[PDB]
Amino acid sequence: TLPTTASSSTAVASSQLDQLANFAYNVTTDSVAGCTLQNLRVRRDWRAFSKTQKKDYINSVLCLQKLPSRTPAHLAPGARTRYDDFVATHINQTQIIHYTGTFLAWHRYFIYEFEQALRDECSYTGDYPYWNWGADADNMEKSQVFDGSETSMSGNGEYIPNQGDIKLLLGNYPAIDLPPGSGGGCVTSGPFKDYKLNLGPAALSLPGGNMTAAANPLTYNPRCMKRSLTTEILQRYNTFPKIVELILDSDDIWDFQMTMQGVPGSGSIGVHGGGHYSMGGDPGRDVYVSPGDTAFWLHHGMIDRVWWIWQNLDLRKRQNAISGTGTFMNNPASPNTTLDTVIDLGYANGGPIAMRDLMSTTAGPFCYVYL
Ligand SMILES: *[C@@H]1O[C@H](CO)[C@@H](O[C@@H]2O[C@H](CO)[C@@H](O[C@@H]3O[C@H](CO[C@H]4O[C@H](CO[C@H]5O[C@H](CO)[C@@H](O)[C@H](O)[C@@H]5O)[C@@H](O)[C@H](O[C@H]5O[C@H](CO)[C@@H](O)[C@H](O)[C@@H]5O)[C@@H]4O)[C@@H](O)[C@H](O[C@H]4O[C@H](CO)[C@@H](O)[C@H](O)[C@@H]4O)[C@@H]3O)[C@H](O)[C@H]2NC(C)=O)[C@H](O)[C@H]1NC(C)=O
Ligand SMILES: *[C@@H]1O[C@H](CO)[C@@H](O)[C@H](O)[C@H]1NC(C)=O
Ligand SMILES: *[C@@H]1O[C@H](CO)[C@@H](O)[C@H](O)[C@H]1NC(C)=O
Ligand SMILES: *[C@H]1O[C@H](CO)[C@@H](O)[C@H](O)[C@@H]1O
Ligand SMILES: Oc1cccc(O)c1
Ligand SMILES: [Cu+2]
Ligand SMILES: [Cu+2]
Numbered sequence: 001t002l003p004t005t006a007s008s009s010t011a012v013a014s015s016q017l018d019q020l021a022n023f024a025y026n027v028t029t030d031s032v033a034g035c036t037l038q039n040l041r042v043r044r045d046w047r048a049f050s051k052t053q054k055k056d057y058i059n060s061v062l063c064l065q066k067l068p069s070r071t072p073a074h075l076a077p078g079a080r081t082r083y084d085d086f087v088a089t090h091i092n093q094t095q096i097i098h099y100t101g102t103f104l105a106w107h108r109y110f111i112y113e114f115e116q117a118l119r120d121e122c123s124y125t126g127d128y129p130y131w132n133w134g135a136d137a138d139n140m141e142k143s144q145v146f147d148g149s150e151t152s153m154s155g156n157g158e159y160i161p162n163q164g165d166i167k168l169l170l171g172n173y174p175a176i177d178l179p180p181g182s183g184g185g186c187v188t189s190g191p192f193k194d195y196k197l198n199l200g201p202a203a204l205s206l207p208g209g210n211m212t213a214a215a216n217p218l219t220y221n222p223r224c225m226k227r228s229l230t231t232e233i234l235q236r237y238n239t240f241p242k243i244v245e246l247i248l249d250s251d252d253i254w255d256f257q258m259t260m261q262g263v264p265g266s267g268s269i270g271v272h273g274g275g276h277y278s279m280g281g282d283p284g285r286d287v288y289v290s291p292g293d294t295a296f297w298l299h300h301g302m303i304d305r306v307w308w309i310w311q312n313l314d315l316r317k318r319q320n321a322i323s324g325t326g327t328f329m330n331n332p333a334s335p336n337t338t339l340d341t342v343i344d345l346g347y348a349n350g351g352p353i354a355m356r357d358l359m360s361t362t363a364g365p366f367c368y369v370y371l
Pocket of ligand 2: 019020022023026
């Protein structure tokens, strides 16, 4: 007897999520029992990682931020590292990978190939980590992902008093206004304290309402990563009731992906936008450059988990479900996304791949589950 309606207590909504996760696990292992049970990988909550396991993942990311970039210098003058290769492709394709029929599948392929770079070029042998927003929604500063310790993705940025609010515009919908959080400047501590963003900004929202952008966001612009942790954003968008509501109240792929990213004109930015903007800073508030924030990978692990749960609740109808076009909010208009639509990650990793081969975590190149 699966839940059918999200509960309003955090604690009960948390148990609903575990139960839906358990069901999705059962369905995926059954379809696997070449992806086999023996080589089925498990992705896990960052809280399940030991201190050594956390440090092994962080070290591999740091390795990727030193190894030289494969992107041709003339196509992206500012790229220096393999990590930059992933940021660059995301900047370059942002207009066709968000609010499109490809949004969920493209990002599944994106983070998988990031994982492959960690394993093949940086000797990583651990599990892929995800960030469970619901456990941190009441105090982001205490998240194991963001607490600033040697096992965080670094923490908060240096505090900047009396910051203006954040104003979010999209088309000519009424603006959405957010608090600026408790940071503002360069991250003060953690393993990514000396790490440099090399690309962007491309569309960086600033406290006060301004939006700054480099003339060419692919030219060299080394600078610190900035954060402004904003618990209030997670409290409104990323709580366990909000997570379960997205899963249970969405009956088709259109409503699922739209509620996740935020329905334009609803005043809500969804679990996707909520998780992004709660980091604040740079590139936390830049849609194009967001992979520059090292927590991007854990945030989209959770995005992919929530999609994988939703898929497995009715696999016959939801496994291959696609809706939307090839352009951001279909502006300008483009043909519908289908299973023959091909996507690629540029020079980041991998090669071109059709939507058909991306829809299941245990087919095509994929062989994993979430616990
Ligand atoms: C931002 O995003 C955009 C959009 O994605 C991106 O632009 C892409 O830009 C890259 C480079 O900047 C492009 O990659 C190059 O494409 C060259 C042209 O390739 C096409 O046409 C070839 C010619 O086809 C004709 O001639 C042949 C032979 O005479 C004939 O048989 C055909 O019928 C046709 O008439 C064709 O060969 C090629 O196809 C092969 O490869 C593609 C995958 O690339 C594959 O899908 C095909 O099935 C086929 O196997 C393709 O159709 C190409 O020459 C060039 O090659 C480089 O790499 C190869 C090794 O792979 C080297 O051998 C070669 O010498 C070159 O160094 C390269 O592939 C890409 O096509 C663009 N894509 C789009 C959609 O526009 C930007 O780069 C992004 N910006 C940033 C910063 O990331
Ligand atoms: C998962 O499968 C096990 C074994 O068949 C079963 O005992 C359990 O109740 C299932 N859980 C859910 C949530 O379906
Ligand atoms: C595009 O998809 C919608 C469903 O989302 C469908 O109603 C419409 O007919 C499709 N358009 C074309 C040209 O196939
Ligand atoms: C439990 O806590 C969440 C925040 O984590 C609230 O949104 C919920 O209403 C309940 O108080
Ligand atoms: O795709 C997105 C959406 C919202 C904020 C962000 O940094 C990225
Ligand atoms: Cu993206
Ligand atoms: Cu995202």
